[PDB]
Design a protein that fits this description.
The structure is cut from a larger assembly and holds one copy of chain A (about 120 residues), three copies of chain B and one copy of chain C (about 100 residues). With about 120 residues, chain A is mainly β. Chain A contains no helices and nine strands. In chain A, strands 1-9-8-3-4-5 form a six-stranded mixed β-sheet, with no helix packed on it. A three-stranded antiparallel β-sheet of chain A has the order 2-7-6, with no helix packed on it. Chain B is built from two helices and 18 strands. The longest helix of chain B is centred in the N-terminal third of the chain and has 5 residues. Classes of the chains: A mainly beta (about 120), B mainly beta (about 250), C mainly beta (about 100). Strand 1 of chain D pairs antiparallel with strand 19 of chain E. Bound molecules: 2-acetamido-2-deoxy-beta-D-glucopyranose (3 copies). Chain D: This is Spike protein S1.
Chain lengths: ~120, ~250, ~100, ~70, ~325
Amino acid sequence: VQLVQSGAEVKKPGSSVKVSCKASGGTFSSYTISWVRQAPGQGLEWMGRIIPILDRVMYAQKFQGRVTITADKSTSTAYMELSSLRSEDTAVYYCARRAIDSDTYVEQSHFDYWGQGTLVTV
Amino acid sequence: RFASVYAWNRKRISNCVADYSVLYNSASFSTFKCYGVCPTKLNDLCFTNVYADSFVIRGDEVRQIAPGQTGKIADYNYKLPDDFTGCVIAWNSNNLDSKVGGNYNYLYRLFRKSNLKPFERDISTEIYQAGSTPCNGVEGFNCYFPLQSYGFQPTNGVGYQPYRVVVLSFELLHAPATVCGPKKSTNLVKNKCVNFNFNGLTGTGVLTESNKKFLPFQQFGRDIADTTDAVRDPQTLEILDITPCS
Amino acid sequence: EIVMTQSPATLSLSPGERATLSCRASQSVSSYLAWYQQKPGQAPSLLIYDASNRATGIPARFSGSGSGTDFTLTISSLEPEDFAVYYCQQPLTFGGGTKVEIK
Amino acid sequence: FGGVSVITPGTNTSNQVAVLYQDVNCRVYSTGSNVFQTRAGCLIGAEHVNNSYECDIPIGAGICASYQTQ
Amino acid sequence: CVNLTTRTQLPPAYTNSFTRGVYYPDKVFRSSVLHSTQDLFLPFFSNVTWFHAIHVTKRFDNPVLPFNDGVYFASTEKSNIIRGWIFGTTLDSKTQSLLIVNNATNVVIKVCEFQFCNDPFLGVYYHKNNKSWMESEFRVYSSANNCTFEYVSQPFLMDLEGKQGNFKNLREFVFKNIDGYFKIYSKHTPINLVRDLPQGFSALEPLVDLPIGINITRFQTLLALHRSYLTPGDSSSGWTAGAAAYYVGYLQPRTFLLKYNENGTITDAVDCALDPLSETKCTLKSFTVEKGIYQTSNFRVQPTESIVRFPNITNLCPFGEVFNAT
Ligand SMILES: *[C@@H]1O[C@H](CO)[C@@H](O)[C@H](O)[C@H]1NC(C)=O
Ligand SMILES: *[C@@H]1O[C@H](CO)[C@@H](O)[C@H](O)[C@H]1NC(C)=O
Ligand SMILES: *[C@@H]1O[C@H](CO)[C@@H](O)[C@H](O)[C@H]1NC(C)=O
């Protein structure tokens, strides 16, 4: 429904980037939230997807270990954490909604609404 | 030690007497309902097969533990035959099965390809597929480990609180009894018109020695009219013919 | 992950001409593709999902085709505002992308 | 659909039987050979003869059956 | 565990079920009556698959067979080779399976997630010492875990000698899996048998009702091997087939008219599906039919396929414009 994200930040190497996207209405009980990174000069690099309903998170191999995702139980709050921020890992990164689901668990094959993002640097 | 519903346990009760004395009237239970025998008469009967199914489910799932009632817990975890004889017993267990951050020790099968038949206990962990791409043990998209724990919490709504469910399933006297309610014996009376009870097969007639033999597992016989012809005495095992009173 | 290769690295055409963009998998993904349009200053937006099925709010000039491992994005007539970098996405991650430039 | 009648010589004599299908106009949903199609239905498993005799087991519509030399 | 070799590819011959495999359908005494019973029964006069072990050939015959709706199983021997059964679905440790094994120490029944040997076996060794046979091997499964059902009986000091001749002891069993219970019935009779089950009649008494909750679609038999000082010591080829036979049939829904004699033994029965005469006997509740015409059941053509052809409606009903509307 919504992808309300954080502002931009600059921080010390090794620090974690902890931000969340808030989705209201019926998002919590339906659609999941996917985190993707818009590295400069690149295409998008998907990082992971959190499903607060199944208590599960799916991750890109590229971002395993460094990216973990936490979420709340009310407003769907996709609280992504990127550990060990490096200065070379400067990017605009964001959340997007995965608009396909079912009660037969076909779950999320694709995306619909994307949030554009915020910059994290050092 | 209650089981996850996806893998509910079961214990056999045998070679024992009583404790069917409307134990539920202690009012420790949120619900008690029998689908066969009326509860107050359970303690007057003999049974050949008695079992207790033991597991933990959410409050809004309690209603699914019933013959004829469909739903995911009824179809993917624990299933009763519609032709069910027994009693379903349940109570709130927040003091044992709930934790502040959620008690996740109890698993449910949420993802399944087919429904269960009565009393099938499927403890498989095969990843469930829901789409055209195989997703072979990937986790995500079209596939998930079939089981999910539920975080029971002491502060959630009642339908989200844990309940302990025990289903007492049993067979009636169609074989020699092994479990009986409490009974007081009286002596065997031969000849004369006498009102008898044994293990059931209650009736009035004249008991005389029979010239019949029963196979070791039969206990009693039947006439063409489907009335008891003769019975074996639970004590000493003599076969007695039941003739009508004049 | 699901590895995808895109081609050409750069496509060169005039506005009004057809733009064809290729994406190829190392493994079959059935019909699970999405296509996106990237612009300077903007993360790419969704054009297509389900390989050929057009996304909500997207103009009729965009459509896709293909199955298994071989997929195409077609813009029947590329507009001056569509000289974007196009990308494919599999259920999990994105391909390399094709830059489109004016000839 | 229809009724099925079984023509039986007494079992203390023979275990051969013949079967009559009430509404079959042969178009039968079971077997063949020894098929006599009559107004009483299809009689399968009996030999029609051009002789005539006293009636033994009646079938209907002028036809009777019997067990003879077997 | 051990993949056995050196075998003649003896063919899957069939025999006649005749009038065997009726069973006692109840646990109630009846006598000097006829009674109509509905159950899963071995059909009369069916083609029963014959299986056979014989050395001469070096034939050991221990395949995976379908369980379907239940299995009629006969065991023919004097040699005590055929013993034990395996029941389950995939039979590969992925899920639980039921293992029933008769060894000299005891009879063990367990339900576990078992790791299969592919072709498991028991066996005896012929010792030079005392010129006698002794149980030496239990190469039955590689492992088991996650065991939920277990029963163990007393010792069975069975005659382990590799006795030759026609077969003298016949056991008959049925294995059927109903509403969570694995039901086992059996009986023993004397024989003089080589290939064709005697044209006899039997009803067998129940033994157990096992409260397992197990899904069974396939089963495999278990056979013993004979090893000696007259064979190679190699575990895959160093063996003797001895001599044994077994038969496998399947149960089908049937109605039988059963005849209970004085003292309640089922003495005879008629399979109501064999032919029009049997149908007549079942209809009349009699094993004797007088000369004449009887009507039996009826004839009805069954459907072969189905038609839906409903309205070609493609849009969806606007329930969401009613519910969650303001
Ligand atoms: C039993 O196995 C069959 C396949 O052999 C499967 O279709 C069926 O759903 C299984 N039943 C249970 C309870 O797993
Ligand atoms: C038996 O042969 C099969 C062939 O597929 C093989 O996978 C298995 O490991 C072999 N077992 C032993 C004990 O050699
Ligand atoms: C044969 O004799 C040996 C002596 O070492 C003994 O161990 C073995 O148990 C005996 N076998 C039988 C079948 O009695």
